[PDB]
Structures are given as structure tokens and as C-alpha cells.
Amino acid sequence: ICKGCLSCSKDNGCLRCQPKLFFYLRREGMRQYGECLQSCPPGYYGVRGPDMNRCSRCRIENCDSCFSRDFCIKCKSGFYSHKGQCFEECPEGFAPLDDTMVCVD
Amino acid sequence: ICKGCLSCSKDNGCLRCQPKLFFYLRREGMRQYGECLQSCPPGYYGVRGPDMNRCSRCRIENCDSCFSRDFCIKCKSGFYSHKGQCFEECPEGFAPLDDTMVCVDGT
Amino acid sequence: ETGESLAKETAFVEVVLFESSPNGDYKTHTTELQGRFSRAGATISAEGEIVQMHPLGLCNNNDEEDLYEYGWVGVVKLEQPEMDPKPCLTVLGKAKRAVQRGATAVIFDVSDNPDAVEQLNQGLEDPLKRPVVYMKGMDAIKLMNIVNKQKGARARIQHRP
Amino acid sequence: ETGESLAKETAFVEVVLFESSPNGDYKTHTTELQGRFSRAGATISAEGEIVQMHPLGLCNNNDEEDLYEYGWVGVVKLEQPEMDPKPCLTVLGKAKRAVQRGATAVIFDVSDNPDAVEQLNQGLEDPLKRPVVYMKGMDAIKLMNIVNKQKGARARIQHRP
């Protein structure tokens, strides 16, 4: 049944979440329904909007976990993190800090 | 272009093949056009019909190579062949011959 | 002083459930529903696979969204107005956004938000080129039952001239 | 004795090419073409993704044929009749077979086989419940060019009396 929502609908799932939680839109074939989660699922990051908290799909190139739309926190293996984006090699101007995968100056 | 066809059109490719070749229908996005091949592609078997030689898709369960719609020549690795079909284990009353994938009566 | 508006034309919506059958053929079964064409969109026939959209997901705010195949018919079940106290978009806005995301047409179930009908029909904004249909009552119940329970379905929205 | 035939109604066929953005939005670009509704099918609007079918592929034979998503618009370019000396099916039969296999409409390019029109409009067989449209000339050349060169396209067949 309707875990985490203050209001729920048989057709649309959750409409508002208890205020801790994140609103996630689950796609199941033709259906799209709302769920309220403690944390966003893999591949998704959370956004605390003015109205509600919600999950959105990470689409940063060569990222394994997004903070926000344009800021990757964990790049995928072999790419260096540079100002929220993931590169095969650091860009000129920066090198990796010692044994790690962060570009620095 | 029109390779192997007796007749050909821009929009349909081959309409008729040179007599030895097999007629295969290639799907490329919205397109579907005729090709005339010496042998049908992987996944397909050839049928010499009354009018034309065609390629048809092998749909036999767990078969890597069809002879016809209903008869498999090469089962997928790890499957046993019996009467043109492919089984994980030889059906009741049959056993693999020697160290092969062919079912014969026994054990 | 203005008089009553012309009635909105009937949208005859055929919902098709389809099933592949022995050979590669399809067995189909049709349900006939009725709604109305709103002034928010053109009065024309449209057809496409049915895709439910949660009303709260139709926003400009959330930006990169998943790519759906072009030409789907959006089904949006509207909730009681107070459930969305400051909408990201008006009902016309949401319909537009669905069309931007490739909708060939949009059907709103307005059973729980009768006021949406006045909004759709205001006719102050310039209409979409695709149909924006509203439905309610048993028609809407039958539509949502299919969406909730079937694997797939195609809507054929017919303008019967 | 029987007189002339009522002229067949015009099918207005919008061919829609679309493009997606990174954000998940689509732009569309439409070409409007014209054909006619034959008696072999209904005179109604239909819409779906365009799929070319080679005439030789529409048979009862080749039995294990592939599976396309329900609701496609078949485009069949007919060749000169001597190019298929013993057809597996008549032109009506081919239209029926496309509908069996999920087509929402069939458009025949009859430029190279104008006698197909007469056969389509005979009205002896039970007509299909989907439109069976025929096109030729400039319009057919344009359709077949889009099929041949572009990646995907959607057809919108409109009946406007």
C-alpha cells in the first residue's frame, strides 16, 4: 500500500510525501506512480525543492553517483573528477592529487 | 546495389534472384529490401521452394542452426539433439551416444 | 452580453488491447469510450500507445527527462485541486509539456477536478496542434482500469465528422 | 447497367519526422501528402510508425515472420505485376496480412501497378476495419524517399470530409 505518503491515490500512487522523504516516479509499463523513499534509488539524486523533495535521474557522462544535475561526486573507474564533471584525463591546468582521481591545482 | 538479382528496384531491392541464390529480406530502420545470397545468414535456414529460394528465421528453441522450421542440426552448446529438437537432457528412454550430444535409445 | 458556449465535440476514444497469437498475428480487443475535445488543443483524430503520466511529473522544473518514443497518447489522472497547492504548471502547461516530450495527444481524467474543464476550455492561450481530450465518469473509470491492469494498450482518438 | 463509380475520398497523409534534444524534447517536421482511401479498408483516420514491407514478404508462407509492435503503418511499394509471376496473395490479401500482423493502416504505392487500384476498389471481399490507402506520383515518390533515407517517421492519415 502507500508507504511514506501523506496523500495517496490508487491511480497515481503518492501525491505528497511525509516531509522527510523523497518523491520518486516509478515507471511500470504504461503506469507511472509516485513513491516516497528515505533515499533516492541507484542512478538518482535527491533535490530539496521549495515545495517538495524529489529524485531525478543522474545523466552526467561517466558518473556513478550524482549530487545534483551537473555535479558528479563519484566518477566511474578511470575518469578523473573535475569541477563536477568526469574526464578520461584531467584537463590541461590540473593534475590528479597523488594516488587519487580528483583533478587539482 | 542489385547484386545477385535478376530484377531489382530502388525501393524494394531484389524482386527475383538469380536461380541459385537465396532471397533474404533485410530490415534497416524503416526499410525492408530484397537481397540475393549464396547462403542464408546466421540464424536463418534456406528453403528451396517451388518458385524461389528463401531464407527463413530459425525459431527452434535452443537451436544454433536449423535445417528447416522444425528440424535443428546444431543445438546450443550443452543441449542434446533428439528428432530435430534440442533438450537440456535426453528425454525419457534415451541417453547421449558415447561422449556426444546426440540422443539414442537406452539408459 | 455573451450567451452559452457551443458544446465541445465528442472524442470517441477506442482503447485497443492486443495480444500476439500463435503465428505472429495479433488478437485485439476494443473498448469504446467517450470524452470531449477541449479548446486547449486541435479537434482532430490521433492515435498512439498509451502512457500514463503522473500529474506532478509534468513540469519545466525537472529538466533532463527520459526519452520516450515519439507519438504516445498521454493519460493524466487529475487529483483534487488541494493536493497540489502550488502547481509547477497549469493544466494547459502540463498538456503542452507532454506534447514537447513527444505526446501525440493528451487525455485528462477530470473526474476529481471538474474545474480543469473550464481551464482547458478558456481559449485564451493559442491551442496545441494535438488533441487535448477530457474524460470522466465511467469512461474515465474504464480507461484507468486498463492503464492500471493491462500490459499495453493503444488509443485511437476519433473525431467523427 | 451500372454507371460510374463515386470518386474515392482523399487521404491526407502527414509524414512526421522528429528530432530529440538532450533534454528529452522533440521537434517535428511534417510533409503533407495525398492519396486515397480504397474500398478494401475503412475510411477513417489512423496513425503510427512507418514500416516498409517488401511485397514478397507479405505471405501466409515464410511462416515464422518477425514481431513488430502493434499499431504500425505499413508502406508497400508495388512493382510491375510481371515481377511476381505467381503472387502468394492478392493485393487485398497482402493488406489483410499486414493488419493481422499489427498494422494500423496500409499505404500502397501503386505507381508501377495502377491495376492494383481497381482490385482494391472491387469491394467483393469483406473490407478491413483499418484504412487501406493508395498513393502514386509525386506523393508516392516523396514517401518512398523518406522511407529510403530518414531514420524513423510517423504517418498520420486523416480523413477530413
Residue numbers in the entry:
A (entry chain B): 39 to 143
B (entry chain D): 39 to 145
C (entry chain A), D (entry chain C): 22 to 182
Paper quotes:
Rspo (R-spondin, also roof plate-specific spondin) proteins are evolutionarily conserved from fish to humans and have well-documented roles in a broad range of developmental and physiological processes resulting from enhancement of canonical and non-canonical Wnt signalling. ZNRF3/RNF43 specifically targets these Wnt receptors for ubiquitination and turnover, hence reducing Wnt signalling responses. Direct extracellular interaction with Rspo proteins inhibits ZNRF3/RNF43 activity. Here we report a molecular level analysis of the ZNRF3/RNF43 ectodomain structure and its interactions with Rspo proteins.
